[PDB]
Subunit: 123 residues, 4 copies
């Protein structure tokens, strides 16, 4: 349903960029480039979305993960985004995210950042 609507290049308020393909099966495959943090170039991302959303003008639930390792850097961390795609003239992906950094069991309590990202097709 929102396969074509989701597929494409998205930008968030930090200037990060997210290229995604939605499969018909609910798959999400793409790359993420973060404008901030210990990151450089593209990182594989994988995820899922509801390929048959409510038809009552609800958004489409989706999420994806990025492990922050590629050929340039390893940040020993992983972010997941959870959110909804809302289509229409100004289509957007509204997300909250959890970023976990590898740590010892002692420092576990302080292992996880939380934030929110809004994605548009306009940078």
């Amino acid at each position: 349903r929102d396969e074509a609507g989701i597929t494409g290049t998205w930008y968030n308020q930090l200037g990060s960029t997210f290229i995604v393909t939605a499969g018909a099966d609910g798959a999400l495959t793409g790359t993420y480039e973060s404008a901030v943090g210990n990151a450089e170039s593209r990182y594989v991302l994988t995820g899922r979305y509801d390929s048959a959303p409510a038809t009552d003008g609800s958004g489409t639930a989706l999420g994806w993960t990025v492990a922050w390792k590629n050929n340039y850097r390893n940040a020993h961390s992983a972010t997941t985004w959870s959110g909804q795609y809302v289509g229409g003239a100004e289509a957007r992906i509204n997300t909250q995210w959890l970023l976990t950094i590898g740590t010892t069991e002692a420092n576990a309590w302080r292992s996880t950042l939380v934030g929110h990202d809004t994605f548009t097709k306009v940078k």
Copy 2:
């Protein structure tokens, strides 16, 4: 590194079950069965993990997503887990998760549950 350690069947305190394969590339593919909620049987999951973790006895950062649609039910929702694998005798995956339910823009404020799951290899 933690490829074999991660790969396998995991259980959480709710009685949910998580079968995962770690690829050498940082991929995570598997199925999730939730003991609770609007869920029944298995749901595809995809994710990522750091395949080269710090060697200072840190955990391995990883995450994954489940869209709650399969052939039996569609819950119009998606969960992402963010966490670390910690190996050793009692290996565990400590996660926090975000669950987003498809909604209208008005009800967006109340679209996202947050929780924590601990996974062990013992049910």
Copy 3:
């Protein structure tokens, strides 16, 4: 420092309103009126802020709680906001919040909404 800057009436993107006094001691006392949810009229709020913030143009960390009970309604729930006050022409309070609803131990997993609120002095 940000005592006068914090003290006053704030509005968020949902149309909710937040009247707060900052004490010199780091106290926050006021009332909250939510434009949404099972709420009506004002609810006591209490909180804390850092009364001696970094002087390097950082924000001022603060938080507060609202139990959603007053003389009109009891929602069996409580929200905490965690955030920073950033002063200047367009002063703002950027928050993430956790809303917990009283539940049985079984339904605990689904007891907590998470969101973000931005507060301005302009409605």
Copy 4:
């Protein structure tokens, strides 16, 4: 209702300690001592709880805030806990928390830790 049940000294899995008085009005006043982080000795805490909970064996929603400034240290940060008190033989407070550190607008994205604390009356 849970005024006496809540009032007292609580301990969490990190070894932190939380002394709280519940007022009849839904107020929570006390001190927090964190076993970890940039903290030392006691920090004022203020909060709210539902003083008339559902009588269907639900928990009591409550929350509180600690600004991490006292006479020994200033951590430029604030934690809020959101959770429920569940009474009975092994009474517990199950919480999720948000910790915000004062930052510049650039580093805002990485300003907020998230975690969970379980409190018991047994250390």
